[PDB]
């Protein structure tokens, strides 16, 4: 939220679940953040990675595995990983 | 569920009209039985002290409440009126004008006094508070 | 008092009131 003067008025901008787009609250302790490392040719790990955060709701449902696998297929396609 | 149709205004209004009679306050107001009460819808009434009586309090408490038996002048109805303010029964005598009021719970009995919803407020034209505080004297 | 027996008692008083007022 921006003020009409042009300042941010929110304490913070919370993360959104990468699968359900739900806002990940500060006390959502079932939420996680996965960093999937990037590998170049020969299999060496570059040191860069992509990040996905899943809300506690999607993990509690059990769809976290399938959601994460679909998200990773998409980004891997896009970045050639 | 409850009716929701745009053309069901009559149903809703009639149902509310019929159900308002279940509310105790509504039915007390719109039954007309409050005109059969001793006061007949008035805040205060005058009456004749018939006899001074003492009626026992409820079970937990042990006291003689020392009320008064009053015959109203507007309708001739006999009621029991409580006399507050310790010692004020001696200001009450038989065949003496008294102004009664409600005991504060709208015809419901108050406190440990059973069957009494009326208090004496004024005797012989002088308020009981003035006689208690000795601000005025009872005329002879 | 049991509600069934209360109802039976009340049916008996009503029988009596009916046989008195009607007859």
């Amino acid at each position: 939220m921006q003020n009409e003067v042009g300042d941010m008025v929110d304490l913070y901008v919370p993360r959104k679940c990468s699968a359900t787009n739900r806002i990940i609250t500060a006390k959502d302790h079932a939420s996680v953040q996965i960093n999937i490392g990037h590998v170049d040719a020969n299999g060496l790990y570059n040191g860069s990675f992509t990040t996905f955060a899943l809300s506690g709701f999607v993990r509690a449902q059990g769809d976290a595995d399938g959601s994460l696998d679909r998200l990773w297929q998409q980004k891997r396609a896009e970045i050639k990983q | 569920g409850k009716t929701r149709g745009m053309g069901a205004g009559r149903k809703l209004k009639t149902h509310r009209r019929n159900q308002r009679w279940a509310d105790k306050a509504y039915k007390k107001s719109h039954l007309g039985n409050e005109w059969k009460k001793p006061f007949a819808g008035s805040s205060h009434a005058k009456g004749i002290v018939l006899e001074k009586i003492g009626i026992e309090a409820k079970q937990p408490n042990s006291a003689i409440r020392k009320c008064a038996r009053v015959q109203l002048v507007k309708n001739g109805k006999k009621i029991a009126a409580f006399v507050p303010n310790d010692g004020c029964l001696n200001f009450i005598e038989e065949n003496d004008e008294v102004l009664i009021a409600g005991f504060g719970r709208k015809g419901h009995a108050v406190g440990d006094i059973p069957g009494v919803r009326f208090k004496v407020v004024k005797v012989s034209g002088v308020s009981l508070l003035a006689l208690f505080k000795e601000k005025k004297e009872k005329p002879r | 008092m049991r509600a069934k027996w209360k109802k039976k008692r009340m049916r008996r008083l009503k029988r009596k009131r009916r046989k008195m007022r009607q007859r």
């Binding site: - | 003492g54 026992e56 003689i64 020392k66 310790d86 010692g87 | -």
Partner: protein, 48 residues
Amino acid sequence: GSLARAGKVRGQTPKVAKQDKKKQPRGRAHKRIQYNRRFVTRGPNSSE
């Protein structure tokens, strides 16, 4: 019941005259005193 004891305690209570004390300021000045006491200076009536 027995009406003979009406006025018992209030008649038994010994009469104690009120002390002739100074009057407190009345109106705006009284509010000034209260404001001073509770803002520029246990409950208000603690038996200290």
